[PDB]
Amino acid sequence: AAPTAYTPLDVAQAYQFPEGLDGQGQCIAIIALGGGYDETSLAQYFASLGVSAPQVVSVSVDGATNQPTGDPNGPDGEVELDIEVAGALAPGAKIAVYFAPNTDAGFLNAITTAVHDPTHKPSIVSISWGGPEDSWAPASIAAMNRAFLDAAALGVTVLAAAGDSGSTDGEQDGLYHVDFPAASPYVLACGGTRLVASAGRIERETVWNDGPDGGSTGGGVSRIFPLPSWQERANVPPSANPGAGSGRGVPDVAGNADPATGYEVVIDGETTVIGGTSAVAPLFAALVARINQKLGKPVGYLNPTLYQLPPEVFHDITEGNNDIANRARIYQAGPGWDPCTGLGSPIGIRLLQALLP
Ligand SMILES: [Ca+2]
C-alpha cells in the first residue's frame, strides 16, 4: 500500500546481477525519438551512486539532436531514465544515444544507424518507445522487423519495453492488443512487475497492474507474427480475441516496473520516481553488457537460447493479471511462461553461468 522506490543498484542486487563486471569494452545504444539529456543530471546521479560515470555520446540521425525540454514530466524523463539505469549498472560500457525524428522512418533509421555504426560499434540496443502492433503501417513493421533480423545476424542484442497499458495497449476497440517493436520475434520483449525486495531476497513479485489510472504491463498474443519455433514449448495460449489464433507471445522476460515500487532517478535536476516497462529494457541491457564482458564475445540474439535454458535461471511470476479494461482477467499470470511476464525475472548469476562455454 505504502509507495516505495529503489535505486537501480538495489534492483540489480535483487535480481543477482554478476559481480566484478561493469561492461568494460562494450557499447550500449539507446534510441530516442524526442527530448534529450543534460550533463548536470547525469554527473550528479552517477556520483551519488558511487560509480565512475560512463562515457555518453550523442549521435544525430536525420538531423535530430540532443535537445532536452527541461520538463521532468516530459520525454526527458524517458531519455534520462534510460541512460541512468543502463549507465549505473554497466558504468564500464560506453553509451551512445541515437536521436531521430518521431516518425516511422526516423525510428527505423536510428536502429539501423546504431546497428551498423563503425565508430561506436554497439553490441546492444535498448528501445523504450513503441505502439500497438496493429496500429502500425504493415510496410513499417516489415522494415523494422528486417532491421532486427539483421542485428541478430550481426551479433547485436536488441531489447524493447512491452508497454504500460495492459492487455488492451491503450486501444478501446473491444479487442486485446500487443505492442511493437516488442512483438518482433527478434527482439527481447521486456514486461513489468511489482517487486518487493531487499538486498538478500525477493519478498514478493507480482504482475504490475494499478488499474486504468496507474497502468499495467503490456502482454498477450501477436496477431502479426506466428508463434516462433523456439517458443512452441512455452505454452503460449491462443489469443483472447474472438476467433482465437496462435501467435508470438509477449513478453519474453519481466522486471520491476510498478511506479508504486519504482526507480529513484534525477530528471532535469529533479530527484523523483519513475517506472513503466521503459526502465526494464535498459536494466537488462546492462545485464547483457556484463555477460558480454565476461564471455569475451557478444551474445547477440538471445531468445532461442533463453527458452531452452533450465527454469532455475528465472524467477517465475504466478500472481496477477494485466487487464485494466474489464472484469475478465485477460491475461493472467500462472506457472511457467505467461502473457504478463513471460519467463519471469532473470537471475543474473545463473544466466551467466548457463551461458559460459
Ligand atoms: Ca509465470
Curated annotation (Swiss-Prot):
Ca(2+) binds at D316, I317, G334, G336, D338. It is found in: Secreted. Transmembrane segments: none annotated. It comes from the Bacteria. It is an enzyme of class 3 (hydrolase). Keywords: Calcium, Hydrolase, Metal-binding, Protease, Secreted, Serine protease, Signal, Zymogen. Residues 5-357 form the Peptidase S53 domain. It catalyses: The enzyme preferentially hydrolyzes peptides having an Ala or Pro residue at P2 position and prefers such charged amino acid residues as Glu or Arg at the P2' position. In the oxidized insulin B chain, kumamolysin preferentially cleaves between Leu(15) and Tyr(16). Its main location: secreted. Autocatalytically processed. The active site is at E78, D82, S278. Optimum temperature is 70 degrees Celsius. Retains 60% of the original activity at 80 degrees Celsius for 10 minutes, but loses its proteolytic activity after 10 minutes at 90 degrees Celsius. GO terms for molecular function: metal ion binding; serine-type endopeptidase activity; tripeptidyl-peptidase activity. Coiled coil: none annotated. Its cofactor is Ca(2+). Binds 1 Ca(2+) ion per subunit. GO terms for biological process: proteolysis. Its EC number is 3.4.21.123. Inactivated at 22.4 and 37 degrees Celsius, but not at 60 degrees Celsius, by aldehyde-type inhibitors such as acetyl-Ile-Ala-Phe-CHO and acetyl-Ile-Pro-Phe-CHO. Insensitive to the known carboxyl proteinase inhibitors pepstatin, diazoacetyl-DL-norleucine methyl ester (DAN) and 1,2-epoxy-3-(p-nitrophenoxy)propane (EPNP). Not inhibited by Ala-Ala-Phe-chloromethylketone, an inhibitor of the human tripeptidyl-peptidase 1. Optimum pH is 3.0. Is completely stable in the pH range 2.0-4.0 at 50 degrees Celsius for 24 hours. GO terms for cellular component: extracellular region. The core of its prodomain resembles the prodomains of the pro-subtilisins and of the pro-protein convertases. The prodomain may stabilize (by interacting with helices h4 and h5) a folding intermediate of the catalytic domain. The catalytic domain has adopted a mature-like conformation already in the proform. Forms monomeric and dimeric crystals. Thermostable pepstatin-insensitive serine-carboxyl proteinase. Preferentially hydrolyzes synthetic peptides having an Ala or Pro residue at the P2 position and charged amino acids such as Glu or Arg at the P2' position. In vitro, specifically hydrolyzes the Leu-15-Tyr-16 peptide bond in oxidized insulin B-chain. Additional cleavage of oxidized insulin B-chain at Phe-25-Tyr-26 is detected at a considerably lower rate. Can hydrolyze collagen and the chromogenic substrate azocoll. Shows lower activity with albumin and casein. Shows very weak tripeptidyl peptidase activity. This is Kumamolisin. It comes from Bacillus sp. (strain MN-32).
